[PDB]
Design a protein around this ligand. Structure first.
Ligand SMILES: NC(=O)c1ccc[n+]([C@@H]2O[C@H](COP(=O)([O-])OP(=O)(O)OC[C@H]3O[C@@H](n4cnc5c(N)ncnc54)[C@H](O)[C@@H]3O)[C@@H](O)[C@H]2O)c1
Ligand SMILES: NC(=O)c1ccc[n+]([C@@H]2O[C@H](COP(=O)([O-])OP(=O)(O)OC[C@H]3O[C@@H](n4cnc5c(N)ncnc54)[C@H](O)[C@@H]3O)[C@@H](O)[C@H]2O)c1
Ligand SMILES: NC(=O)c1ccc[n+]([C@@H]2O[C@H](COP(=O)([O-])OP(=O)(O)OC[C@H]3O[C@@H](n4cnc5c(N)ncnc54)[C@H](O)[C@@H]3O)[C@@H](O)[C@H]2O)c1
Ligand SMILES: NC(=O)c1ccc[n+]([C@@H]2O[C@H](COP(=O)([O-])OP(=O)(O)OC[C@H]3O[C@@H](n4cnc5c(N)ncnc54)[C@H](O)[C@@H]3O)[C@@H](O)[C@H]2O)c1
Ligand SMILES: [Zn+2]
Ligand SMILES: [Zn+2]
Ligand SMILES: [Zn+2]
Ligand SMILES: [Zn+2]
Ligand SMILES: [Zn+2]
Ligand SMILES: [Zn+2]
Ligand SMILES: [Zn+2]
Ligand SMILES: [Zn+2]
Lengths: 345, 345, 345, 345
């Protein structure tokens, strides 16, 4: 089968021909219908040799949808041909966190050598992929695979970050979304569907502010030095109830601390090495909590899929072949994909 | 192997010799160390022939603990010899409820023909038992098996019922426990461990009021017509924040409605055919919710086990052999077991 | 001043001329701009003489909005001319419930002789009214008074009932609304604004099903014997996550019990003497809670007003003069007001 | 009357003779029975002249209990002689936060010139004090005033910090308490009363580790570089579910980040200028939230009082006269008071 792999340290990924795998007991083989491109795949390829420990070769792609091709021994609950999304952050399945479906916060996965697809285990950028367990598949019915692949991380991650503080986002609340890309443009639409919060979007690029307005933001403001004062002019001086930072650079976190309300929330979702919120007295308002969330829970992926099936999420994508995989990663590095890149085998 | 089975409709259970089973893919064989006796086994044996559909024969026992004897193909996460409790209310493992570990509220188990051990699938009253999946086992370490078997239902069910309204039970709150038997005497101890609620126990029998005080109730009162006024004398006339009725007879539910506070809770846990709360205006205080909960979640069983391991639960038991199984069920019918009956093979 | 009063037992209310009151210390005098008509005013007038204890005469109207006319001694936080809604369910202000703004569940108001406006204290169906305390006023800014008066009960009561179980109403959930009148037509719009639940409306009258669709219900079905099966055909057989019954007749509660999902909720909001849910095993699904809520909290009234100011609530009203008050109550008895009746002085 | 006042910038507080005040409309005069000494009074006296804006003179003491001496015009709900604790963080009483009793997070108090007693308004270190409003008094019944004064901040602040994440602290959880002084020794006892968490105390001083064990900590460990690993040896490697840092120095926050579990919580309660948590990827575990809470809510003070009345809180105090006030502040600066200092007029 054709696959896109990271083969040596520092080099760009290449297209290869490798064996189609076979499912052992409890496993499921999927024929891949769509694989998302995210910055997690870039992060893995930008590690120095001394820090890298995901193995070589590594099939990329941690966002994946497909159809069930073959069932391993003892697997029931799915038939051949069933369309399914892959739950990405694989946990042990047995700890207190995993027992509530919160495998994203599994306290044992590191020690057991359980790694997610595309980040240690083979990913979705191939004609076929193995899924370790039935509990990591979610049915998608007749949802278009191209629009569904982004739901497994571009949808799941913002959905989770929002869900952690949903009781704060009542009528009269304000939510700020910083960064209107793959994650951010889906986050705006989740906020509108599951809350009555007023939504203010922030980005560097005028074209991304246009995208923000297209997907339902109430206002959109230019990022940088003027952003904090512009956000406060919109909120009448009270501050934003919640800030969802999908950039996570030091300057965007600083903006978040300058606009968050007393008893509010900052969610640092975007990943920039070294950047951090400074949570201490006189540096942040009283009662304003801060967290770096990771991925999402099993039930949250099901809820994101239910939003898509009800017509509440317009996912903006650009489609690539497997041969175009390397080129699509270059496009992702330069920030020229409007929404989520998706590879179709 | 020796086992206690229901073999014909209307007759008492008998001791039999049947095949020791073999675990298929995904399954685990346990050597049973302790099996609890509950009223669910009685309910099953008291069904008329036209209503019964659990199959004959049926190995009894839906409360169970054991040691892992054999792993079926593909099972990891457990080694041979590991001491484990069985999670009883088996769900499909795939629906929204099951994805949060709430298999007690699985919306699909009926349609798929998934039945709990002792209530359609073979139970724990035997030398060995099959468990369908690794996710239905919880490690217990060096906990005494006899004191651990009751935790799987006598512990789990009250823990769940309490957990549904735990935020109501702050300092200054009052919780009433009606019925101090297998479930009720564990429920009192859970309330004391996980809340600052004042606990008032209610029973017909002076010996059970003594048990209530032994396990930490702040007061204990006689059941019947005078119970409502006696409870109100203890609460200064304000009413009880929550009432956990582990009897569920019409007279105890009536008492619960007469004592519950405004914005309080009644949990109807005990099962008496035909009995029901009457929830309407002028029949119950404003904002007082009522529910019939069932069993508990996976994470809740783990929490109950953590309470036992920390020394917070003194489980009162009487021990029987497998040969004494039929006799022990007669003892349970007449209400002469002080706490939970447990069979040890 | 002109006012509409209940003057003798069994008779219809009459228009009268009475003294304009003066505010004592802590009190505020409002010039009334709009007063809602609800069934609470009917209930008060339909009491037998032996049960009635609200005093005679009694100025009707427990839904009220106005402008601050005069401040009593020591009152700050409002200026003359400020537009305000009246928080209806007056509590003691000092107990545990009142300290969280939950004055609807005040445990002391009965014993202290604190009565709501229109139900023991003089109501809003007059040119002026006294409000006891500053904490019972909520600013409405430039909101149209006619559309704002219904918010104080037709808005507040459904908002509260929904808020009690909002975490259940995620994407993929279904909420059933029974009765599309004053409360029900606002309840549909609250569900759409603060959740992603699919909304199914139920009523006897085809004209009210039309109203339901106008205000955003996803489906609307005829009430009565066929309603349960019709609701289950729409939910694919799974049942409704929550049922909000704004009728509360025995037949509608029965329908609610036949459609509610496992681990769901029934809110009995409508008031029909004698009617009640029957909460017991085999009469309702496992884990399905039932409650009769009353009115709402202070913070909830503020949130309802914030929804109105954001344009999320289209309140259907018919306007009457004070002279037309008696006639408007006859219209309310026969069910010929489409939405909420409102009196404008 | 005698009082302890800050009279000029940079100087120590002095004992003075000033007028006994009279209560205006809505106000209550208390005869003070006990006044706590906290670091908030130190912070106020250590401000440079250009930053100080609380006025001179300033009567110190923001922890206070007393008996009602005189009622201002229009005040009901209290009789002369009633024993009461003062709710410290005075809010406007009208905003969304204040309507839920969360006056600690009032968004409007600054703009309205409402200041707490001892921090802008006259405090409790005097024979008498004015309280602005009846809603800022909580009845204490026959509680010893000396043990009750600390409850208003040493009790309230930890109770609030704990309450924000109480659902995380189930059986099997671990809570770390850093700093066993006024706040910390009460925080340990709250954790034991309202949760089943294992409690690990941390301090620099062996005498304070002894105090931790006296008030019910399950273990006590020396602070500094080895504290992290010592806490992990006690938790079997999993990390602490929640860390309550009542010191808030950079070294204790660093310790907190090294021990907190995935999906856990750090509460930075102690105040050290410049110190802060660093919340960013690779510096803190996934999902671990951080906050600086302030004081507590009205309902939380009531709950703390209910804990004291049930015998769940042993408050360690040292008693001083008003003449000893200045000396007692010197003792507080050098850290030589074992628990909470309390002044008795
Ligand atoms: N926490 C998690 O589990 C998780 C999961 C997935 C992705 N991520 C991270 O989220 C981030 C976003 O991912 P994506 O796929 O949506 O990225 P993307 O490239 O699709 O979009 C980036 C967007 O951010 C904007 N942007 C860049 N710098 C900005 C600034 N200073 N101010 C405002 N806007 C700015 C860009 O204009 C663009 O609109 C990445 O850092 C990624 O690593 C985190
Ligand atoms: N909802 C669930 O998931 C669930 C799970 C397990 C058991 N149950 C049910 O819980 C109930 C109790 O189970 P158990 O094993 O504790 O029973 P048990 O026989 O061990 O205990 C019964 C106790 O209730 C007391 N009692 C009986 N009638 C009473 C009355 N009118 N007033 C006060 N006290 C009275 C008895 O003296 C005894 O102490 C049963 O009805 C059982 O079927 C429900
Ligand atoms: N719990 C509370 O705090 C509270 C507060 C306010 C009102 N209420 C009660 O709520 C109820 C509704 O109040 P409202 O002012 O909206 O009434 P309304 O007269 O404005 O509307 C009643 C609606 O119910 C419909 N209806 C009647 N019988 C029905 C049936 N069997 N099935 C389906 N639909 C039916 C009617 O067609 C009508 O549209 C009243 O009983 C009132 O007393 C309760
Ligand atoms: N956030 C709030 O609302 C709030 C409210 C009240 C007090 N506070 C603050 O809380 C802190 C504690 O107040 P308190 O009155 O209990 O103080 P305290 O002086 O009574 O207690 C200090 C305790 O901390 C210990 N300690 C000091 N430095 C330490 C270190 N580096 N490592 C470990 N332990 C150390 C001491 O040995 C002592 O046990 C202060 O900073 C105070 O300003 C905050
Ligand atoms: Zn990603
Ligand atoms: Zn795990
Ligand atoms: Zn049972
Ligand atoms: Zn299921
Ligand atoms: Zn009404
Ligand atoms: Zn009250
Ligand atoms: Zn303090
Ligand atoms: Zn306020």
């Amino acid at each position: 089968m054709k696959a896109v792999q990271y083969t040596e340290i520092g080099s760009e990924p290449v297209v290869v021909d490798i064996p189609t795998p076979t499912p052992g007991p409890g496993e499921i083989l999927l024929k891949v219908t769509a694989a998302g491109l995210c910055h997690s795949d870039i992060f893995v390829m930008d590690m120095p040799a001394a820090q890298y420990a995901y193995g070589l070769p590594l099939t990329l792609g941690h966002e994946g949808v497909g159809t069930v091709a073959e069932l391993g021994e003892g697997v029931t609950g799915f038939g051949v041909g069933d369309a399914v999304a892959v739950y990405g952050p694989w946990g042990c399945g047995a700890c207190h966190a995993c027992a509530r479906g919160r495998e994203n916060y599994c306290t044992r996965a590191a020690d057991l050598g359980i790694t997610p697809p595309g980040l240690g285990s083979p990913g979705s950028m191939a004609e076929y992929m193995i899924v370790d367990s039935a509990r990591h598949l979610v049915p998608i019915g007749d949802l278009d695979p191209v629009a569904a692949a982004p739901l497994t991380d571009a949808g799941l991650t913002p959905y989770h970050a929002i869900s952690r503080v949903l009781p704060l986002l009542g009528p009269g609340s304000t939510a700020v979304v910083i960064g209107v890309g793959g994650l951010g443009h889906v986050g705006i639409q989740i906020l509108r569907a599951v809350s009555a919060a007023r939504v203010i979007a922030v980005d560097l690029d005028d074209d991304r502010l246009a995208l923000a307005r297209e997907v339902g933001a109430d206002a959109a403001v230019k990022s940088g030095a003027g952003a904090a004062d512009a956000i406060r002019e919109l909120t009448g001086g009270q501050g934003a109830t919640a800030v969802f930072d999908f950039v996570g650079a030091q300057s965007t976190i600083d903006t978040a601390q300058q606009v968050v309300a007393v008893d509010g929330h900052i969610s640092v979702v975007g990943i920039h090495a070294g950047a951090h919120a400074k949570v201490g007295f006189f540096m942040i308002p009283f009662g304003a909590s801060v967290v770096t969330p990771f991925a999402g829970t099993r039930s949250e992926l099901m809820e994101v899929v239910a939003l898509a099936r009800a017509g509440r999420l317009d996912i903006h994508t650009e489609t690539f072949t497997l041969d175009e995989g390397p080129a699509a990663y270059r496009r992702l590095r330069e920030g020229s994909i409007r929404g989520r890149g998706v590879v179709v085998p």
